[PDB]
Amino acid sequence: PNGSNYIKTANPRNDLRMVTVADYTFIVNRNVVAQKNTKSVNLPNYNPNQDGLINVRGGQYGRELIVHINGKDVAKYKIPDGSQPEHVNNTDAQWLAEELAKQMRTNLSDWTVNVGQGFIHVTAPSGQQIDSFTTKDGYADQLINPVTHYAQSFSKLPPNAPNGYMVKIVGDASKSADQYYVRYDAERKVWTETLGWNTEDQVLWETMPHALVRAADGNFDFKWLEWSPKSCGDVDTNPWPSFVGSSINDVFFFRNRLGFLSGENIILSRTAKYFNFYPASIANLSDDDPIDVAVSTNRIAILKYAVPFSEELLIWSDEAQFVLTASGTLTSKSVELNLTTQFDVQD
Amino acid sequence: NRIAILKYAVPFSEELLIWSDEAQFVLTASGTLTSKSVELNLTTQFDVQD
Amino acid sequence: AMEIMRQTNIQNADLSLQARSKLEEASAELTSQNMQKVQAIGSIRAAIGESMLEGSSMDRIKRVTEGQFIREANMVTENYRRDYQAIFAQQLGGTQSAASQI
Amino acid sequence: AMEIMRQTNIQNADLSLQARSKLEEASAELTSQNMQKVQAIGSIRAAIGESMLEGSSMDRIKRVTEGQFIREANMVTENYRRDYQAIFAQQLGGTQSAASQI
Amino acid sequence: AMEIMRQTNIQNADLSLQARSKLEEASAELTSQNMQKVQAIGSIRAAIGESMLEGSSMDRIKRVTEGQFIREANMVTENYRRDYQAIFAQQLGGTQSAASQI
Secondary structure: OOOOHHHOOOOHHHHEEEEEEOOEEEEEEOOOOOOEOOOOOOOOOOOOOOOOEEEOOOOOOOOOEEEEEOOEEEEEEOOOOOOOOHHHHHHOHHHHHHHHHHHHHHHOOOOOEEEOOOEEEEOOOOOOOOOOOOEOOOOOOOOOOEOOOEEOOOOOOOOOOOOOOOEEEOOOOOOOOOOEEEEEEOOOOEEEEOOOOOOOOOEOOOOOOEEEEEOOOOOEEEEEOOOOOOOOOOOOOOOOOOOOOOOOOEEOOOOOOOEEEOOOEEEEOOOOOOOOOOOOOOOOOOOOOOEEEEOOOOOOOOOOEEEOOOOEEEEEOOOOEEEEEOOOOOOOOOOOOEEEEOOOOOO | OOOOOOOEEEOOOOEEEEEOOOOEEEEEOOOOOOOOOOOOEEEEOOOOOO | OHHHHHHHHHHHHHHHHHHHHHHHHHHHHHHHHHHHHHHHHHHHHHHHHHHOOOOHHHHHHHHHHHHHHHHHHHHHHHHHHHHHHHHHHHHHHHHHHHHHHO | OHHHHHHHHHHHHHHHHHHHHHHHHHHHHHHHHHHHHHHHHHHHHHHHHHHOOOOHHHHHHHHHHHHHHHHHHHHHHHHHHHHHHHHHHHHHHHHHHHHHHO | OHHHHHHHHHHHHHHHHHHHHHHHHHHHHHHHHHHHHHHHHHHHHHHHHHHOOOOHHHHHHHHHHHHHHHHHHHHHHHHHHHHHHHHHHHHHHHHHHHHHHO
């Protein structure tokens, strides 16, 4: 299935190095480098600008509403400050939204306007974006929160949202520590972190290690393992694996995690799921995160081979041998590399 | 790393030993034997027969 | 009577704003318990992946702690729903007394 | 009515003074969390600089703790903004009731 | 007098709703102490089964900790019953004063 191109080489022996763990014996070609697949981006050019969610919150009775659309006021309605018990409808969420949204339609149809139990959504104008979105209704904007796609914290994210959306919560631009992308899924009221704008989620696959597996029918299938999609926001925050430029030099099952010894990096896949190499989640450390580490030492050292052993993998490199040891749960937190011997090795 | 049938077992005292066809593993838990503390170790590799 | 209707309706809108605040801080509580849950279940996966136990009973312990956190979330959302019942019924009773005086 | 407007305006200025005190004590809270953040991120550098791990995943953990502090700062400033909404709306409603009686 | 009886009866129904909430949160407390009790008595069995002491004295210690938790449950239900006495007697006294004024 999926070809047999990866196996081929002029000298099969030197190049094809492999490991075996029952169901799937992983065959990894030293020779062929990986490539990021840029023809399959998830978000092509998410138009951050086009859509704004007019939050639907409490009216506060008399405080009138002015909501600029694209920086131009078209949304003006003042709540009927009428005592009548019937008049009290003047402030409920759905009705207030209707008042405001039909009014948006009147000014221009380029942007389509909608009503949701919790929101009013502007469909992107076909060519013209919201140049600027702002609103000052009521004294503290306690009726409508413009939410945009960028906001300050976990807070200030609207409670109900369309079946797909994107919100990037950023602490400040220079420090990217808290940046992560959140999407709202409608069926279950939940908000999840899915990859963000414009970053492809997968390596070319073919170029990555292929796997030899045995079918239930007693014949065997060469196959491309379905390496995991990153599923986290932004290229920088979820670092690309970084073995992509390099050949995958040897493959090793240290601990329980799968692992690739790359050009200078021990890229160890998330420890308990064999194929989810990219960081599992952006803003909360999970010890089941993969460990991507490079042995800098004081001399750039290619890592030639690796030997699994038991408690601690040993990494052998051309000019030194280093042991990565962690008795506690192997995690990014406890790696503890040691350089302890200095004998030489050859190819 | 290899599906292993478990052929025999020997009770002993503090820790049962499990003998299997291609490896021998010891399940040891000094604390109350519980799902939480099993702590299996693979420590020998001699073969056994039926 | 007009002043009375307006005052009671302003109090009701204040209570609704209060409800909105309650829901969003409840969301901030749920998401914080989530931020704890991710670290916990990550630690659990680390443990299970490293001991070669490979067992349904381990799977059982993972499901046990997951159910722990799920019950906790259900507890906090039940707290929210009780508070909503309280504030709604309160504004209803107030409107009723005002209507009787009217 | 002059006494009434004077009294309500004095109460409003008192509330604005409360807003001033609130913002400055929020600044003292932010700067204290900063004074904790400096020590924490210093410890983290110390750790990373000493193990030769030198990795993107290693940087990832630094970014994780940095994002933690940032989130707490955001929580603090969101608390301040909610308190500001509360006090503003309170003085508004008071001025409205006084205007109706006037 | 009709308004008075309506108001006192609404207060009484509010108190009965409070009694409902009280009983159900007492049930949530009892079940939580139960959720602690299961883990505790599981640990105790584990201990007794492990040693081979096979002692009536270890049966006695198991019964001791079980009685501990049973007394705790009896304490919480007694708290509930005292609160019920309080709220009942309170609504009764209120109805009596309203009846005297009537």
